[PDB]
Write a protein that binds this ligand. Structure first.
Ligand code: NAP
Ligand code: NAP
Ligand code: AKG
Ligand code: AKG
Ligand code: CA
Ligand code: CA
Lengths: 414, 412
């Protein structure tokens, strides 16, 4: 440890990403960077032991220190309750954190020149901002056990009126029902971040909704974006020869699929969650994408890997079999977090380190050293041989070597 | 107008699809087929005129006659209300029809061997069955004007305690809120249709949900599928060497993107709606896809194009400008409906005709006569010249001749 990093909130995860997380710290961060590290273990076991209170604490710590880096976590269902002998099916730690912090989640592929895409046309990046607050992650769902009436009601805080809407009358048998909601202020912040991101990149902005189907719910997003565009941002867009356009999600996914890339895609929370996986895989790997939650203040960020804990690879790890799991997304959670840390503190040595590690990661892959997913992009999956890639440790070690070299050359330079 | 078709419900649409619809009847269907045809105009003007009653009437007619073919329709938002001077913002006719009929919507790309895909890997078809009932199409959404409590309650029919849950307490400002629901029986029918489709195609089946997030709501879909699989179709799958698996939707879309295709994808209503467009475009055009609603009765069917009315091309049509818009999906709405009609009536002539029109459509494109979208698939869009594609009228004409030849050559 030499560079003085400052205050960072670290959230430990589960399964294969927890393995990779420790390797990143040991071989990449800790040798070169001293951090005041506020560490919260979001491993499923510690969440169960704390009644998921560690998750709320971690989110409050991020508010305090303005940067956090999160490892992927298990969101348990019934099967996970049985697997770990959990007390309850805990809520997604990502939902909990994003709903405490608010803001927009920006996701973008990590491009290496030698890696063929699955989608032939994307020669420019697609950047998905997605609203981080509300909707399905805050929803209230339940089983309808039998016949009866489901209603949803709104009571203003003065208690002077009540509006009851019929959801469904279940005449025969049961089913499921759910309420969900969003807030105007959170929607307004989301539009601002989306418009500002478009201007920062010089790219057109598209917002996707279902507003033809949900006329009030999605119509509110469409209206808030349009009001804020026509008032504040529309001339700035024209000055850069870019535009803002609302599209139906149906049209939007087809346009993106056939596009060349090079646009900002504003998504509702659920669409951004799902489409970012399609996009990341389309550029060739879920392991090559960045995800940063940018809070409305412009000060606080949470960087993360958007993919999951890679359970299938973890099961092989548990048997001693070789794994090749792409660490790049998890590494970029650290570099994006430290880069923001550096900016807040005007720390040039940290800013240099964060970019250096990003450069090493891409250069290493472009020199032919990669995990199996990326070799599968170059070859076909059925054509890949063991000699074509590196196991998770071998790849981390190669990154470690090249990082030491790159930082050694920087010190020698000038 | 020789072959006797039987009874078919026709639903007329809007904008560019409406133009193509009448061309298909004139140049393709009516010369070779006589039908007992119950026509319902779902064009946005007639729906307004009838206060949407025509949409429910058409759905009731499909229940009666077991087959319908639907042109794409406008679902109005505020901008459409002003455009057409509408009385109300009408609900989607597709939502209305699907929730009356129930069942599963099956969507599959129409493959021409000369058309390159956007997605490198898919050499086998992807069939999305999607639940036709409930969820977002049946939702109750509203604006929250200001601070206050939104709650959701369940009052059982047995007189027992009413159950109340807090949705959100808005502490400052307003927002939006929505209820939505689904029914056990509809989910069970959706499960059975999915398992049977996989066995009939010999392909593995995947169900995608968000059940880690919606634990009760999406958990019910996952539990019902798993229960019906274990007790009913499991041994049949193993005999055919296929399998059923639930995946989270995040994993599923990425798995699908990198696959070679060749599976049935069971989706919830909203996911199937959206993913079907991404899959159709990935095989290279929104114009090449079949969409067939299969009702739980095993009898009734509604065939449609899954895409919209193509407003942008319609606006150019309104200016007298040349357009190239892909009719194939609107045509396959006709062929799929007639094919089902022919199966119900055991009409071997109608069945032959329906297949022939499909073969003609594919063979025409495979010969190099295609609309602009398909030309763009081959050459890339910036490289497409005018000599590479036929305009919408030209393309319909070329299909009409190849059809006339294919049936005359079959007269032998
Ligand atoms: N950000 C988050 O905290 C987050 C997000 C999503 C899911 N999860 C959680 O993760 C757990 C597992 O979910 P899941 O199995 O649906 O999905 P997953 O962990 O994302 O992995 C599913 C598949 O995606 C591929 N993959 C994902 N990340 C990869 C990487 N870094 N390198 C190489 N391949 C990668 C692998 O494909 P192959 O099998 O073909 O090799 C893997 O088997 C669940 O408990 C879920 O709740 C967490
Ligand atoms: N089944 C239905 O009744 C249905 C389904 C969806 C939407 N709609 C309705 O249709 C209206 C417009 O929707 P939208 O503009 O979002 O999408 P759309 O009408 O489906 O088409 C939008 C874009 O998709 C491409 N496209 C769709 N069909 C095509 C075809 N047959 N041939 C060539 N290209 C095709 C065109 O791309 P390019 O612009 O690049 O040429 C078009 O501009 C709305 O009122 C909506 O409610 C109806
Ligand atoms: O939190 C979860 O359960 C999944 C999160 C996810 O898929 C995402 O953030 O893209
Ligand atoms: O009914 C609508 O408004 C849209 C329908 C749609 O996009 C679909 O059926 O896939
Ligand atoms: Ca996701
Ligand atoms: Ca659709």
């Amino acid at each position: 440890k030499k560079i003085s990093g400052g205050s960072v909130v670290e959230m430990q995860g589960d399964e294969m990403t927890r393995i990779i997380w420790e390797l990143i710290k040991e071989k990449l961060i800790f040798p070169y960077v001293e951090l005041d590290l506020h560490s919260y273990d979001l491993g499923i076991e510690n969440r169960d032991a704390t009644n998921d209170q560690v998750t709320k604490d971690a989110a409050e710590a991020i508010k305090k220190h303005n940067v956090g880096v999160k490892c992927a976590t298990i969101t348990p269902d019934e099967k996970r309750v049985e697997e770990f002998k959990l007390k309850q099916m805990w809520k997604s730690p990502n939902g909990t954190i994003r709903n405490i912090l608010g803001g927009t989640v920006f996701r973008e592929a990590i491009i290496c020149k030698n890696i063929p895409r699955l989608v032939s046309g994307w020669v420019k990046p697609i950047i998905i901002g997605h609203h981080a607050y509300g909707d399905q992650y805050r929803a209230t769902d339940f089983v309808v056990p039998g016949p009866g009436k489901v209603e949803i009601t709104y009571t203003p805080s003065d208690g002077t009126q009540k509006v009851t809407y019929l959801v469904h009358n279940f005449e025969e048998g049961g089913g499921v029902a759910m309420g969900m909601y969003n807030q105007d202020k959170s929607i307004e912040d989301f539009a601002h971040s989306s418009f500002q991101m478009a201007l920062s990149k010089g790219w057109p902005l598209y917002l996707s909704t279902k507003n033809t189907i949900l006329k009030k719910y999605d119509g509110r997003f469409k209206d808030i974006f349009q009001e804020i565009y026509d008032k504040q941002y529309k001339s700035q867009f024209e000055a850069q020869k870019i535009w803002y356009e609302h599209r139906l999600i149906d049209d939007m996914v087809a346009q993106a699929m056939k596009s060349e890339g090079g646009f900002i895609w504003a998504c509702k929370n659920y669409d951004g969650d799902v489409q970012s996986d399609s996009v990341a895989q389309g550029y060739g790997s879920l392991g090559m994408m960045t995800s940063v939650l940018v809070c409305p203040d412009g000060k606080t960020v949470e960087a993360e890997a958007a993919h999951g804990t890679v359970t299938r690879h973890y099961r092989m790890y548990q048997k001693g079999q070789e794994t090749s799991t792409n660490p790049i997304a998890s590494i970029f959670a650290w570099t994006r977090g430290l880069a923001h840390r550096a900016k807040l503190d005007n720390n040039k040595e940290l800013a240099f380190f964060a970019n250096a590690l990003e450069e090493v990661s891409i250069e290493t892959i472009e020199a032919g050293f990669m995990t199996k997913d990326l070799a599968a992009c170059i070859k076909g999956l059925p054509n890949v041989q063991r000699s074509d890639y590196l196991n998770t440790f071998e790849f981390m070690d190669k990154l470690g070597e090249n990082l030491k070299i790159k930082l050694a050359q920087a010190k020698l330079s000038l």
